[PDB]
Amino acid sequence: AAYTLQELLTIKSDDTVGRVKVYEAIVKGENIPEPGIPESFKVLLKELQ
Amino acid sequence: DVNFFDELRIGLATAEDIRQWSYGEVKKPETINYRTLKPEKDGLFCEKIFGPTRDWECYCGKYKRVRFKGIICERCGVEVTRAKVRRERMGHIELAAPVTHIWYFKGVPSRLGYLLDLAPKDLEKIIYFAAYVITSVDEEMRHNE
Amino acid sequence: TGGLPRVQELFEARVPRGKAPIADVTGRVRLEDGERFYKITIVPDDGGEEVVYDKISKRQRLRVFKHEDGSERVLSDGDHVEVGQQLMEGSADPHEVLRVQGPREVQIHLVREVQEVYRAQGVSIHDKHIEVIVRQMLRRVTIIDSGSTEFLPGSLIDRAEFEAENRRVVAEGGEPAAGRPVLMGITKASLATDS
Amino acid sequence: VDRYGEYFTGAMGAESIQKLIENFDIDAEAESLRDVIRNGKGQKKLRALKRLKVVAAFQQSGNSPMGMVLDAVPVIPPELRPMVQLDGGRFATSDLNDLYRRVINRNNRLKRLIDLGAPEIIVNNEKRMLQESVDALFDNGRRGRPVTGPGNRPLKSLSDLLKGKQGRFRQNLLGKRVDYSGRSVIVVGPQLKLHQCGLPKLMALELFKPFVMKRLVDLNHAQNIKSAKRMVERQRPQVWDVLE
Amino acid sequence: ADSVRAYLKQIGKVALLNAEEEVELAKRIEAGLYATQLMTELSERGEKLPAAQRRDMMWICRDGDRAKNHLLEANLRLVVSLAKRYTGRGMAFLDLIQEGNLGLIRAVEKFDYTKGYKFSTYATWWIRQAITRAMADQARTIRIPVHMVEVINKLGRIQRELLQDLGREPTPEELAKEMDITPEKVLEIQQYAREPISLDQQLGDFIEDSVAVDAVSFTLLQDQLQSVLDTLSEREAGVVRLRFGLTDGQPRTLDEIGQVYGVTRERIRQIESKTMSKLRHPSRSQVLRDYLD
Amino acid sequence: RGIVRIGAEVRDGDILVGKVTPKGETELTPEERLLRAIFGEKAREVRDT
Numbered sequence: 001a002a003y004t005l006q007e008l009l010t011i012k013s014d015d016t017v018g019r020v021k022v023y024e025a026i027v028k029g030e031n032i033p034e035p036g037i038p039e040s041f042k043v044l045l046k047e048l049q
Numbered sequence: 050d051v052n053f054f055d056e057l058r059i060g061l062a063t064a065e066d067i068r069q070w071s072y073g074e075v076k077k078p079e080t081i082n083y084r085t086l087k088p089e090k091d092g093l094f095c096e097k098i099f100g101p102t103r104d105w106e107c108y109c110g111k112y113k114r115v116r117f118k119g120i121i122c123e124r125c126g127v128e129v130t131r132a133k134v135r136r137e138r139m140g141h142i143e144l145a146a147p148v149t150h151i152w153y154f155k156g157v158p159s160r161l162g163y164l165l166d167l168a169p170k171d172l173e174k175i176i177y178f179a180a181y182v183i184t185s186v187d188e189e190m191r192h193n194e
Numbered sequence: 195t196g197g198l199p200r201v202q203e204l205f206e207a208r209v210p211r212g213k214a215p216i217a218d219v220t221g222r223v224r225l226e227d228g229e230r231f232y233k234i235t236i237v238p239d240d241g242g243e244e245v246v247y248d249k250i251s252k253r254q255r256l257r258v259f260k261h262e263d264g265s266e267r268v269l270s271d272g273d274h275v276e277v278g279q280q281l282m283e284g285s286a287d288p289h290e291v292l293r294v295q296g297p298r299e300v301q302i303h304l305v306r307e308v309q310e311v312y313r314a315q316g317v318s319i320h321d322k323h324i325e326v327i328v329r330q331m332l333r334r335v336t337i338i339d340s341g342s343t344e345f346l347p348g349s350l351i352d353r354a355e356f357e358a359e360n361r362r363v364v365a366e367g368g369e370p371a372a373g374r375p376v377l378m379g380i381t382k383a384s385l386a387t388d389s
Numbered sequence: 390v391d392r393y394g395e396y397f398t399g400a401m402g403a404e405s406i407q408k409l410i411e412n413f414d415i416d417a418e419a420e421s422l423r424d425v426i427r428n429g430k431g432q433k434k435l436r437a438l439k440r441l442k443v444v445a446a447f448q449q450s451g452n453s454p455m456g457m458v459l460d461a462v463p464v465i466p467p468e469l470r471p472m473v474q475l476d477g478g479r480f481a482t483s484d485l486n487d488l489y490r491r492v493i494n495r496n497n498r499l500k501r502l503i504d505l506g507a508p509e510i511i512v513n514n515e516k517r518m519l520q521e522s523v524d525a526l527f528d529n530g531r532r533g534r535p536v537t538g539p540g541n542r543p544l545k546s547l548s549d550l551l552k553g554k555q556g557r558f559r560q561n562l563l564g565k566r567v568d569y570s571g572r573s574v575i576v577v578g579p580q581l582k583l584h585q586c587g588l589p590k591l592m593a594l595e596l597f598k599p600f601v602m603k604r605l606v607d608l609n610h611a612q613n614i615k616s617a618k619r620m621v622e623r624q625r626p627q628v629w630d631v632l633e
Numbered sequence: 634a635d636s637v638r639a640y641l642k643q644i645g646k647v648a649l650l651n652a653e654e655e656v657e658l659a660k661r662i663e664a665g666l667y668a669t670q671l672m673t674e675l676s677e678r679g680e681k682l683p684a685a686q687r688r689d690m691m692w693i694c695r696d697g698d699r700a701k702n703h704l705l706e707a708n709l710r711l712v713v714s715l716a717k718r719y720t721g722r723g724m725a726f727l728d729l730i731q732e733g734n735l736g737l738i739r740a741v742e743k744f745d746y747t748k749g750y751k752f753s754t755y756a757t758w759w760i761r762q763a764i765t766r767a768m769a770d771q772a773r774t775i776r777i778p779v780h781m782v783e784v785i786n787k788l789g790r791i792q793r794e795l796l797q798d799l800g801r802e803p804t805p806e807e808l809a810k811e812m813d814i815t816p817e818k819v820l821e822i823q824q825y826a827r828e829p830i831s832l833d834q835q836l837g838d839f840i841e842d843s844v845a846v847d848a849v850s851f852t853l854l855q856d857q858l859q860s861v862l863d864t865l866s867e868r869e870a871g872v873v874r875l876r877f878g879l880t881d882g883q884p885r886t887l888d889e890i891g892q893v894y895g896v897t898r899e900r901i902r903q904i905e906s907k908t909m910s911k912l913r914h915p916s917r918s919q920v921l922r923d924y925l926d
Numbered sequence: 927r928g929i930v931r932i933g934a935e936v937r938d939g940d941i942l943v944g945k946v947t948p949k950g951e952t953e954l955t956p957e958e959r960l961l962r963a964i965f966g967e968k969a970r971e972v973r974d975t
């Protein structure tokens with residue numbers, strides 16, 4: 001179950017952008033966005049940079 | 050960003066590349082101002098180098114609308130955008146003397162050691178200003194005279 | 195031991211607590227018994243040297259391979275036993291099984307041994323589950339001779355890639371590298387990863 | 390130096406190592422190392438091979454070894470080392486701030502010192518302190534004594550943000566608490582079909598709250614969505630029909 | 634190995650100053666000053682005598698470089714001893730020493746050959762000022778002004794002996810009644826004297842960020858607020874989006890308000906009253922009641 | 927007094943004690959100057975805790 005676990009680990013806990021977009025899309029009555037790349041990734045790269 | 054990463058790769062940086070990542074130079078040791086609790090000009094928190102504090106706002110107060118996206122204020126130089134860029138723009142420091150990276154010197158074995166064919170102890174002596182090392186010999190001039 | 199420590203130790207591939215010996219070659223049983231320590235000797239069939247062991251008399255001498263194949267018949271010296279057969283009662287050590295009888299045989303031993311702990315408490319897993327992890331153990335090589343290849347003598351290297359490098363350097367007249375199959379524990383083999 | 394000023398030059402310092410690596414050519418040593426490998430007396434030779442590996446790396450990479458002496462240092466963005474103000478007026482900051490500040494200080498003071506002119510012992514000491522400072526910023530306690538800030542407490546370095554149980558690599562493996570979730574006590578219900586399950590309606594009201602809100606402004610029971618959310622907080626009798 | 638040690642060695646290598654070296658340095662500094670004036674005069678005119686007759690003064694320049702440098706070596710060992718009293722509280726030991734060197738260099742330049750006195754007193758009273766100035770500049774994590782540094786120095790140093798001399802904890806009011814004599818400045822002085830505590834010393838987990846959920850719901854509020862007020866006119870919404878400013882947002886000056894509306898002659902202050910009855914349409918319909926609630 | 931009288935059955939979310947913190951002094955928002963201007967209700971120097 002790739003999409004469920006990727007959903008738990010990202011928009012349901014860490015990504016602020018993600019949670020805001022999902023909440024908004026649910027209240028609006030449109031599709032939830034398909035899960036992409038966490039905002040956490042760019043932070044891992046800024047720290048390795 | 051595109052969703053397609055075949056693979057990730059890592060490497061060494063370069064001063065000419067570290068200058069590329071940067072948005073300013075931090076040259077003052079000071080952090081936020083004590084009185085008003087705004088960041089201090091051209092230091093480890095300043096809005097010029099990194100990002101504006103609140104969303105769509107410069108520093109002095111000449112713009113606080115959202116109508117102006119991407120403009121750079123000519124009285125203090127901050128850029129009005131989302132405050133989220135406050136965690137994506139990186140600083141840079143320019144050292145009057147070149148230091149070595151600790152990861153290539155204290156690891157076992159030191160790779161710097163293997164490149165420059167020294168004992169590790171003597172490499173440590175060179176780095177820390179406790180032993181002189183002879184860089185370049187003018188051989189042609191020595192043989193001539 | 196028989197419980198979850200025996201299963202854990204088997205996957206780690208560490209040396210067992212019994213470590214009963216197996217026949218390094220094939221020969222004839224010749225056991226002299228000292229009261230403090232036994233000595234087990236195997237007189238080779240092919241010829242050459244005879245294997246020597248100094249095993250405690252604290253264990254129990256195992257049943258011998260015989261034409262009768264009685265499991266109740268203890269080992270009586272003067273006999274001819276098969277190569278690889280176990281000598282005393284206890285646990286055979288896996289690294290020795292592998293070096294003596296190739297990669298397949300130690301696979302058989304690990305599947306049977308990890309399964310034989312569950313067939314006692316009454317559980318049953320299907321063999322492929324065990325085999326999918328045993329495959330993750332036995333798939334690297336430690337290299338005796340570096341030769342013309344690049345990698346250091348005595349390093350844990352992948353199998354397929356060891357073969358590929360060896361045939362490329364062989365493609366130019368360069369000397370091959372001499373590598374043997376190694377068994378690894380499921381903590382010293384998940385450490386050596388390539389990502 | 391006085392006898393043969395025109396014949397050699399040699400520096401003490403890290404700037405020396407940089408002129409040495411620059412004078413160094415990678416392809417030149419590599420061939421000689423391979424020939425050492427080719428020859429016998431392997432025990433001595435094995436040492437020549439450990440060199441060969443490190444050296445050949447830099448040849449295959451396309452990356453010059455010059456990138457091992459820093460002419461500039463990056464500064465991590467300001468948020469990943471935050472200084473936020475607590476509730477009681479106290480400032481709560483991160484440890485990296487003390488390290489960057491330190492390197493900035495020793496740098497500015499060194500450069501003005503070069504401007505003024507100074508003895509060699511003072512300039513060499515300041516260079517030394519700069520190298521040691523940036524060294525502890527990249528990885529603390531890796532060379533001599535770590536640095537402690539308040540009360541003999543080692544400072545969390547910048548390489549400290551990657552390693553450990555709390556580092557960035559370990560973060561996603563351990564697991565975190567989520568949203569849209571609850572838990573309770575389970576009783577058996579032998580009435581249910583194998584695909585059904587029984588859900589306390591007081592808990593299934595909370596869990597699905599936003600959906601109840603969308604359907605509740607959709608019905609028009611609540612004039613606006615924000616008001617509707619308020620309605621589900623007071624468990625009004627109209628929301629159960631929608632929550633079905 | 635460790636850093637303070639090697640520098641202590643370097644400082645201790647050269648011989649300490651004494652009464653015999655008083656003459657050596659006094660003569661050398663005087664010679665150096667003369668060398669500086671004689672060398673300086675030739676450069677300004679632009680006409681220079683031969684270099685062979687100037688090499689003598691170059692030799693006096695080498696003597697003056699061994700005098701400035703070696704005299705400096707004599708002063709360093711004093712710099713360390715003077716640092717030993719400052720090292721505990723504020724900064725690192727070697728940072729303080731380095732500032733002693735920097736101050737000494739500034740101090741040596743400001744020196745007079747004619748006056749003769751011990752170096753401890755004169756030099757010490759010149760470099761302790763540099764030490765205290767840089768120390769007071771960069772010791773704190775958040776920079777503070779110098780009079781706050783003095784006030785916190787006085788109250789902190791008198792407080793530390795008052796608590797143990799009295800035998801009881803100094804009350805929050807009388808520590809200020811000694812000098813500040815204000816009850817509202819106590820919290821402030823103890824706030825300025827507090828230092829920022831590490832987040833790692835979890836600690837940050839207790840803190841709450843708040844507002845994304847209510848700034849999202851506030852963007853929705855902006856949607857509904859734009860949608861509701863559609864029954865009015867364009868003129869009246871002009872002065873609604875000018876001095877108040879729905880999308881713009883500034884309590885602006887009425888003249889520049891009158892010059893950005895395309896209508897001049899301050900006519901929008903006369904139309905400002907001809908629509909307040911129409912501006913009563915949203916208040917009588919009671920439409921903005923669910924957002925301020 | 928600000929405290930609930932003794933014996934009043936309370937459903938959750940209700941107020942038991944009514945306290946207000948003196949709200950941190952920021953500027954009054956202009957959009958909020960028109961929003962509060964149409965009705966005439968000032969966000970006082972106090973938030974509700």
Ligand SMILES: [Zn+2]
Pocket residue numbers: 107108109110111112122123124125126127
């Ligand atoms: Zn500005």
